Symmetry: C3
Subunit: 155 residues, 3 copies
């Protein structure tokens, strides 16, 4: 203290980065390559484990550029002080399934991914490459008092 322990669970994992002095969170990288078609849901593995101390919670949340440009929706996960397992990114491709087809996948910048081997995809499908910035981790202090039942509130 004040130090957060980080455990890499595979060779695909990458150490989170907080480059600027002013930055609030840590860049979280994907440890796997996954293709998400319209409406598809998944929990993307980071192969990263952290030991958040008591009196804090980690917010594994979306990234500003990715969430604004793409239909990829990350549900902010609340990381407990007592969770030492693999950090998973709760994600949904919120693009509508209009049953149309295209030869182009989309990257996390919403650009068309040009392939030399031509394949057929559902329109609005995204590919997340291994090692890409898709999320960030912001840790905040928490207040956890012992609950007391009342019939009416005082003051």
């Amino acid at each position: 203290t004040n130090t957060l322990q980080v455990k890499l669970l595979s060779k695909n994992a990458r150490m989170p980065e907080r480059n600027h002095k002013t930055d609030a969170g840590y860049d979280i990288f994907s440890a796997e390559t996954v293709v998400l078609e319209p409406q598809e849901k998944a929990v993307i593995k980071t192969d990263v484990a952290v030991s958040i101390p008591e009196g804090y919670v980690g917010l594994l949340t979306s990234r500003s550029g990715v969430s604004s440009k793409t239909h990829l929706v990350i549900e902010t996960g609340k990381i407990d002080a007592g969770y030492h397992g693999n950090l998973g990114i709760n994600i949904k491709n919120d693009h509508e399934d209009d049953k149309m087809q295209t030869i182009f996948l989309r990257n996390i910048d919403n650009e068309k991914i040009f392939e030399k081997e031509r394949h057929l995809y559902k329109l609005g499908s995204y590919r997340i490459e291994k090692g890409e910035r898709i999320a960030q981790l912001v840790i905040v202090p928490i207040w956890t008092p012992e609950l007391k039942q009342v019939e009416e509130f005082e003051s």
Copy 2:
């Protein structure tokens, strides 16, 4: 202090639970049974009232297991220090309305609910039973300074 007051508004309400030492939030239970079809929006009542003190905000947020497994999307509500009313869960069934039908409802674990009385439902419909863990409450300290307008930023 440090104690949070909790008020139960009906016999359907349940006292929030923070079982583990390390846990950041309190399990929030539903006080009503509701069936949400695709795209349907609702505010589910908890029949629970809290008196968060000044200098804090309550985050009435989604649950890790429910949000990952089901298309049920909870918008994290910001609970003011001056809100003593019924806590409502802002929820949407984000499952697409593909106009298909099935005889099975889905629980908060995304399992098919087997009924003895056969009924016809829209595909992707969920049922939330009374007294089920659907949300959690995480309270965090806040910073609220008196605003000052500037033409340029200093340092």
Copy 3:
């Protein structure tokens, strides 16, 4: 300190408001009039700039009444201590694109907007007027320790 600097970037910008003593956040107003059809994504400009000090993060988040009543989904943006640019609201009209038409737009209260000049819109389209409360800003303390890689966690 304790004071947050606010910079207005145009005549369309409005000073954020924290009216009640108990309120956790500041009302954020739109600086532009925009019509969002089903599934459409945009970053609405506030023309407001803030200088959050180090050791804090700003949560530019949804509003309780708007998010519950309308299909307008705001992704909570994490505002760094080192961001002095225009605050943008990351928004999506999550209403399904069922290819139906209506003569009525919808306001942020989900009411039909009556026009004297009759126009044809896609069903589930919303209009956000300039100067309307669409979001709020909640600032919270953060914990940013220097990371240390471990092979196993201690205690």
